[model samples]
Target: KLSEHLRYCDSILREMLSKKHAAYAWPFYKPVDAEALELHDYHDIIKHPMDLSTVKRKMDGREYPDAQGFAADVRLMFSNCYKYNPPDHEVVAMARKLQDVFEMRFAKMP
Candidate 1:
């Protein structure tokens, strides 16, 4: 069932990367460059930083012990946005869209 779970995770990620979903996904493609962006106290605010690239890499490497672990990081990626960016920020809006789409996909996971 481990392989099944892994494939389910991969399929959901691929769905997020699909053309229709791509627009809302770019902001989460990689880690937030807090230093370069001059986002003050970003690390302080987001203790457990996560991103799609990191999740994809970990998925490929079989780093996750289970699908729930994979789901946690995926959610954390969105969680960090709400913590670091203002509620009205454009990126936050994008994150919210993608997160909702992801959860919908997750809900149908096999």
Candidate 2:
């Protein structure tokens, strides 16, 4: 059951990505064009900002390898953003959109 839920989340994410969702595009720590205000870097930022709290909340009780393990893939993408310095408002807005997408996916899950 747990695996199935995770798979559903993955599928939803893939579908959103295919449709070019902001979360799948700009991400948390990627570079965004200040002038044009567009997201330039394309990398998965979830694994980094995920944190244990977020994982626990999202998984609803599922256990993962570890907090460090969960964040590894996302660290690089986030670090890249630190150098470029995208606007905070843009980041927050994108995060909210991503949250909405996740919420919608969970609602459809069994």
Candidate 3:
């Protein structure tokens, strides 16, 4: 069951990255470029930064212990978005939308 769930985690993440969800998922596809964006305080505030690319890489590396850990990282990405970005920021809304989409899919996994 553990190995089975690991595969499911990968599939669900792929679904989240699919073309249909591109608009909402694009912003979270990679780690935030704190230096290029001049977000000097980002690292200070978001101690445990998370992103979809990082999640996928970790999954591929077999770093996650289980699907729950995988889901937690996904949730953390959105939580970080809410914590760092203003509620009105466009990406914040996108994060929420993408999070909803992920949660709905995640809940379906056995």
Which of candidates 2 and 3 is the stronger one according to TM-score? 3
The C-alpha RMSD in Å for every predicted model, in order, reads: 1.6, 9.4, 1.6
Best by TM-score, which number? 3
Please give the ranking of all candidate structures by lDDT, highest first, separated by commas.
3, 1, 2
lDDT of 1: 0.87
Candidate 3, residues 1-110, lDDT tens digits: the string is 23788898898889888899998899888899899889999999999999999998898888999888999999999999999999999998899999898888888887
Worst 10 residues of 3 by lDDT: 1-10
lDDT of 1 by residue, 1-110 (tens): 24788888888887876788888898788888988999879989999889988998888888888889989999989988988878999999999999989999898886
| Steric clashes per prediction | 0, 0, 0
Give the whole-model CA lDDT for all candidates, comma-separated.
0.87, 0.45, 0.90
Q: List runs of model 2 lying over 4 Å from the truth.
A: 23-25, 29-48, 51-88
Write model 2 residue lDDT over 17-67, tens digit each, in one string.
444674434453233333364433323432233322343344455543433
In candidate 3, position 17 carries an lDDT of 80
- On lDDT, the stronger of 1 and 2 is 1
TM-score per prediction, in order, is: 0.91, 0.41, 0.93
Off by over 4 Å in 3: none
Query: Which pairs clash in model 1?
Result: none
